[PDB]
């Protein structure tokens, strides 16, 4: 379930792989 979260934007991921890559999409364009 909600194991990982992208802070600042408050994104709630059930995936870790998608979470971490999501914090990547923030560094990227």
Q: How far apart are CA 10 and CA 2, in angstroms?
A: 12
4 exposure class (CB count in 10 Å sphere: 0-12, 13-18, 19+):
middle
Q: Which of 4, 11, 13, 18 binds Zn ion (CB under 5 A)?
A: 11
Total number of residues that touch Zn ion (CB under 5 A)? 3
Closer residue to Zn ion in complex, CB, 1/28: 28
User: Contact between 19 and Zn ion (CB under 5 A)?
Assistant: no
Q: Which of 1, 2, 9, 28 binds Zn ion (CB under 5 A)?
A: 9
């Amino acid at each position: 379930h909600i194991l990982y979260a992208c802070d600042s934007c408050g994104d709630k991921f059930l995936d870790a792989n998608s979470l971490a890559q999501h914090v990547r999409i923030h560094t990227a364009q």
